[PDB]
Amino acid sequence: FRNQYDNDVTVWSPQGRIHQIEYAMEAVKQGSATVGLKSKTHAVLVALKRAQSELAAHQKKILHVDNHIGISIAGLTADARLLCNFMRQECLDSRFVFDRPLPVSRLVSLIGSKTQIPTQRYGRRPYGVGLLIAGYDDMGPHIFQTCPSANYFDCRAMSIGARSQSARTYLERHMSEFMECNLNELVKHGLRALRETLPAEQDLTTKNVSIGIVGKDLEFTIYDDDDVSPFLEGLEERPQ
Amino acid sequence: RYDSRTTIFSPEGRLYQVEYAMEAIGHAGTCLGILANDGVLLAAERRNIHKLLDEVFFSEKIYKLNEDMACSVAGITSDANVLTNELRLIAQRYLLQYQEPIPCEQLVTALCDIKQAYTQFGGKRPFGVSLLYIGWDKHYGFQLYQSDPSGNYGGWKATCIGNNSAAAVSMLKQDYKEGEMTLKSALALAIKVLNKTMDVSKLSAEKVEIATLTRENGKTVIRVLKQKEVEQLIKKHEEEEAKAEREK
Amino acid sequence: SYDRAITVFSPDGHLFQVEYAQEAVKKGSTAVGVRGRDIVVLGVEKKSVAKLQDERTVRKICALDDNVCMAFAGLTADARIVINRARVECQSHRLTVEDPVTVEYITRYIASLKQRYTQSNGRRPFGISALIVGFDFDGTPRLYQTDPSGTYHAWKANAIGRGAKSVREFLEKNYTDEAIETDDLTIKLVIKALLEVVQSGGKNIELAVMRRDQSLKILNPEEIEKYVAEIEKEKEENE
Amino acid sequence: SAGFDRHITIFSPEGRLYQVEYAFKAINQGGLTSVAVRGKDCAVIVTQKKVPDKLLDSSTVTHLFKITENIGCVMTGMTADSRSQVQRARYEAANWKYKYGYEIPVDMLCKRIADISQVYTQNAEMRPLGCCMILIGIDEEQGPQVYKCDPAGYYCGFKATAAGVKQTESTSFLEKKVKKKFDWTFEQTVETAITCLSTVLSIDFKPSEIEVGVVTVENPKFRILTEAEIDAHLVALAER
Amino acid sequence: SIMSYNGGAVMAMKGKNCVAIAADRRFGIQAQMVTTDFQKIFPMGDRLYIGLAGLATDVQTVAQRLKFRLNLYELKEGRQIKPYTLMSMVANLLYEKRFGPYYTEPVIAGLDPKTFKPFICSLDLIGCPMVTDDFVVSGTCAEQMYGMCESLWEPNMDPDHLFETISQAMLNAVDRDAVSGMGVIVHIIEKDKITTRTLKARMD
Amino acid sequence: ERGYSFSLTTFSPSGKLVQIEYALAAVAGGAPSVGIKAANGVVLATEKKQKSILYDERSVHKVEPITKHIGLVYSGMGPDYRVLVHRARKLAQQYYLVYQEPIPTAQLVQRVASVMQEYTQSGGVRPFGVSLLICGWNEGRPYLFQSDPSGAYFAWKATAMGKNYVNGKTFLEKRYNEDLELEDAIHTAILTLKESFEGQMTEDNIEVGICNEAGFRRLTPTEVKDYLAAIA
Amino acid sequence: TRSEYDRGVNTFSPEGRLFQVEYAIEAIKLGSTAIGIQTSEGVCLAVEKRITSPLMEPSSIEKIVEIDAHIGCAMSGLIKDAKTLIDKARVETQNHWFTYNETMTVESVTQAVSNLALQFGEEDADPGAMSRPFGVALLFGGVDEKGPQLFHMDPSGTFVQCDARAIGSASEGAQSSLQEVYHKSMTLKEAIKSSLIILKQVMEEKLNATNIELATVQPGQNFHMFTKEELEEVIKDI
Amino acid sequence: IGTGYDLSASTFSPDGRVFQVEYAMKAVENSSTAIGIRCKDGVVFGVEKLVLSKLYEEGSNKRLFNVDRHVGMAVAGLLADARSLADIAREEASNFRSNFGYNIPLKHLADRVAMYVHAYTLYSAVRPFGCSFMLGSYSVNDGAQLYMIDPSGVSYGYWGCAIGKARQAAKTEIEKLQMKEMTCRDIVKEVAKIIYIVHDEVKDKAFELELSWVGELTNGRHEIVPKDIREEAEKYAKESLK
């Protein structure tokens, strides 16, 4: 087997790749799609909730870590949850020692440092969770996407997960309004993005969508079926 | 297959590494001990005396442990030395803690627990050494125990371990009269067993290593048979064999 | 493949090392224990010592505390180690709570010890199954079986080791409420179950009886001949 | 027969440690060569310099270094292993000076660092630092010493030694020179080293392609022979 | 005053090709009297005996760990322990706990196993080794026994004379102190016989 | 049999650890060394021959003293021999500190055997590829021991290991007698070095140390040259 | 060639799957069927005994246990694995009743238990912990400040609020039946009747008193496991 | 091909080479291209950053870091590797300042970071840092230095070097530039045109240029090129690239 080079993260391919890292990268492609948008003063995280069966609740994909910073997970439940407790502990430690919120860029930098150790050292499996980070700090809203290759990017938007290329090309079609949009406009743009991800037979129902919005004065608040109801009342109809 | 580290279980349940540690004792020197009415002894084979060994030693296969504890060794030399040192440490730790010589059964169980711990876990090769402890205790007088690299043990009145051990023990049990041997008859029986089990027409006293344990005058004395004594015993058994064959 | 790894699930969801250790008990020796109204009995097949073994140190049945006993099937070194650990834990439990250890507590400790020995590499599972017996403070007869998988279970009368299936079926067909009315009836049942597999009788069987806090004495080899005379007498009596 | 060449801690049949020889061959992999010659009261070290381009800083690519103020060092092989080993040697020499209050003799420094490399090759936690060492210095009542250390931890004093791709031919030339039993004065030692390098390389090098270090009794400081003096020495050799 | 917490009195003596060791038998707390069977003299061999002075329980602990380590050494070597090794061994046993010192001042005496030359030694609380060619005492009666053994001892003293001298010295020295007394055990050991006695002194 | 010649913690189904045997094979390929116990002392020697006379023979010594009366020689790996010397010195000096008495050579051999067999306990650490020859004088008796990579230790009236050890052993058993004298012991040792020296021993080509009632001392080059001339 | 990635939990498939975790998931189907249903009046837990021998003591085999008087449990998988899980859950509930002196919500119960879970590949196992994924699927039900609540726990550490979830050997079929047999307004009595109906349709043998263990948790009373007479009463109707 | 020898970094080759560091070489050569040039009174850095998606914000994955106030950080390879190496280097500089009380020389920092990256090269339980990074500084009493340190662990001194898929290409067109005399003002132009010519437009398009420098022009302080000088450099590029 020529793929004896993908059994641990500590071996390189003959062509200079770490195939285990690439498999971890592709792992988050399995999870459900999730797209985020940010305005002049407001950043939104909208995700597509999934359920094991219709007789049970949908899997939460938007996680609250601190009043100003919020995360969205796509990938392994275990790794994402561990990253979430790590995020909460670090945000609290920052609030305790500096009395200031953890910067989005600094938080994502420590996330990268934490998740690089499994990539570099034998032992812990690489953190195979795609994280969408949306928060607020001195220069306004930020959207940070932390790829499971222990890499992160400052993005205007990103959709990570299953069939996320459709949302990616939707946002590629629709940059020109993201910067100047208000809450409702950006929310409807994100909903159209997920609807692009979602196939024809399915639609963004109340139980299907999860919306998280942060801003300058508005904390990272996550909406649910009853809470997403006013935001989806302004939503248009699917252009089918 | 299932011949990897000892912490494995064959589908039939066998511990193959422990099994090999068992059969490895068949490569060790032959040593036996038997229980007499008023005495106990250990007979051992000096398999390696080529020409130039200084014999700067008190006994090679037989190792003393305590004023009351003595054993014979059969296995790898390194594990042999480690086992003897741990035996001394445990026996004297018991003496210091309890101000009484350690019972033979208790010390035997201590060694067996260590040996099991060396095959129970840790990815360490089990001690490939089988021991024959000889000693006295006020609880059961004279006792002889046969250790085991597996970590088991047994109380025996006649037992041989080493090369050609199966035939030796078979004939030994064929010719054992329990409860009615003194030290002299026990010595004669051990010498005959050595005659039958060694690869020599006439075994030399140099190849033979005998230590006898006996309680008298309120104290237990452990002595290895001196060269004069062992040669006298072997010559007596030799003329006894001559008597047996001339009568035959 | 998936067999030579203690902590690796098989594709069909089996820890094959654990099941192999469990199967290692079936190569031990038959040990059957029955709990009665006021008695608990332990019947084990004794290896006939050839000519020289000292039967005093071939102990198959051992008591963990003055209120609990146990017989084992499996490798003797593992049984000795677990016996030492479990009686040490009984003493430490009496240190912590001052009251006699209940059978449930000691059985749970034994199961947890075996389990912690079968959840990591570099630690071979204890390949022994032990039948825990004893009376509680209120003198209720309880009997427990511990499995090398690290689990325990409450059995009214169970058998382990080789031929344990035959003894199990025998007990199923013969265990009655009236069969435990008297101590002698429980004894008759247990010797019958023993001779089901060890048909030689006489020797090669060891028995221990625990009544309501008598600090059990193993039945000595004078009334095993008497009790087997009784067994043979009842046996020619119904036939 | 074979297949035992995978682990440093595995004895092959016939009791041959393959991986150590693999490291010895890795010494040559640097592609360079070095020689050391000792006189009555001097010890000259010279090594070749290869520059792929002018783009590099020649002042930092020196291949010979200074362990302590009177102990100099030259080495070859992998340059990363080289710098790690010189760092370890300097650490050990400083520790020796701290603990024992006087400068480390060359023989003891070689012995201790060879013990370190032996411990490296005895346990399977270490790649055995595949770079060979040559150490020079002056000691009272014994004079100049030249010592060589190898990844196996084998150390020995040399009247003259060599290393690199041209090890065997350089050693043969050294034997041919030492069998004549001549005093080898300081300039004579230096010229023997230069002639050895030039002939075993067959290049008749320009003076800018060699770095030279020398320690003498009158100059116990390990003096790195500067461009002026190496020019004097080797162009004098040219005309001489 | 730690010495006064239990007290004691030991003395060692040698003569011509023989050794004599004597020790007190009293056991009692710093103020009250309890028993008279305390063992301050201990057999480190057929001709080796060690006397201990210090806290009673500290004395017993150091004696027991000494016996453990000495049997370890005897099993490791197979030879009788030559008494200078014993003195260095006891010095190490005391010193290895310098920051946790056992407030115990022991003493040893014996003979050389080969040439049968008697040897005695003295040890300090923190373990200062010391050897004398004449005599050595330890306990609470150090001053009196020191002085009167200086005024009484003679070199090259015959075995019967050795027993008489040790008996008179120890008895008339213990007549001068109270916390140590009420029975003294005397052990004279020669290369041929070991006569174990207890001289009749006052029971007071 | 091949799947078991790869670790030190797995027993071969028939015999024993194969890595120990391979370490022994490494030992048997080393520099020949011969030790001889005479009536009044002991002598051990070895060959220091190496190509490239450029090598400084005085720089390293194969015969080293452990204490004032204990010396040792090896056959096999060099650096492992140095490490063994270091550990032996530390152990002997620990014994001296504990007992304030020169360390008996039997205990030194036992302790060095324990320390080398320690490296054989677990995997990831290879056993020493070196066998030791221990010379010592104590209690009016010259002691000669051999320490093994396996941790085994045994006594020897006169032995020789390393390259061509079988021929040297045959020579010794055809030469040695129990009433041998020290000078004749040195003569026999140098002859044993000779019969397989392959290249005309010089004063520095061999290295010989001697121990007696006056402690242990490695012979100086002058005495070595004198003895070589006497044997011729 | 999957074989290089099933060996060990710290491996990633080319499809990014955790094959060890998937095997642990499938190992749930080795356990007996457990069915829990959530109703406004409470939650009831129904399980199969799978008694090996009539001589067995039915009290020993535990398919439903109590973590606290207000909460209930159901198991499917290894007995010892679930034993450690349940012991940790009880220790955690007493930890909460210590720290906050309150009854801790079932979602937080499954949170803490899942925290003990999904820790197999964690470096904090140096003192000693799971080197292998926990091999039992957990069914948590009870009443808290949000009324009756039932949560299903996945050996991977995932949890989901489920109105009616079935775990064990017949999880697929029992779930399919519960899909159409469940209504939101179902009463406790009719819910338990439906649950035993599903068990009867699913279980390998006939339903008798020794084939089913039954549990109920309502806001009024505490955790009640149906006794022999209560089991007979609830089974005589069906 | 070395199969059976390149599964770990502690195993040599029959030819005597660790294939893990060679594979790290291969990975670096399969990475982006970064150039640096040391001027008369400072050093400058240039990064060719590919915008993989316009969705990415500008300044994302910033690659010209600054380990210390007077020390920059250019790097090519893995961004996670780059950040981890930058973090350990920053901790090293902070420890040097805490223990020794002054700024860390570039050569000494390079030696320490090379030793640390070697410590990850020769172990078996870890992997060598498969990223090549640049060290640049300007000290008024020491001078200006530049260093390239690859995963092989060798920290050599280069006047101005490049790393990436156009290593030899950037060598060819940086050799023609004369270097030692002009300062940052006349060196930023050359860096800009070099970066804009090495990049391939038919394949691997969509790149932006970011720049940073250290020197007395900002008082020996590393910082990104000011927006005015940045657009001026871009204008010189578009004029010169024609």
Residue numbers in the entry:
A (entry chain L): 2 to 241
B (entry chain I): 4 to 251
C (entry chain J): 2 to 240
D (entry chain G): 6 to 245
E (entry chain P): 2 to 205
F (entry chain H): 3 to 234
G (entry chain K): 4 to 241
H (entry chain M): 3 to 244
Excerpt from the paper describing this PDB structure:
The 26S proteasome unfolds and degrades hundreds of proteins to maintain proteostasis, regulate cellular processes and generate peptides with second messenger functions. It consists of a 20S core particle (CP) capped by one or two 19S regulatory particles (RPs) that gate access to the CP proteolytic chamber. The redox-active thioredoxin (TRX)-like protein TXNL1 is expressed in many cell types and was proposed as a nearly stoichiometric component of the human 26S proteasome.
In PSRpt2, Rpt2 and Rpt6 are ATP bound, while the other four subunits are bound to ADP, meaning that one hydrolysis event and one nucleotide exchange occurred during the transition from PSRpt6. Rpt2, Rpt6, Rpt3 and Rpt4 are in contact with the substrate, whereas Rpt5 and Rpt1 are disengaged. We noted a clear bias of PSRpt2 for being TXNL1-free. Interestingly, PSRpt2 exhibited a larger gap between the coiled coil of Rpt4/5 and Rpn11’s Ins-1 region, perhaps increasing Ins-1 dynamics and destabilizing TXNL1 tail contacts, similar to the RS. PSRpt2 may, therefore, represent a PS that is suited for the removal of ubiquitin chains during substrate translocation or unfolding. In case a substrate contains additional ubiquitin chains, the proteasome would not have to switch back to the RS for their removal, as the PSRpt2 spiral staircase would allow a cotranslocational deubiquitination while TXNL1 is dissociated or transiently shifted to a low-affinity backward position on Rpn11.
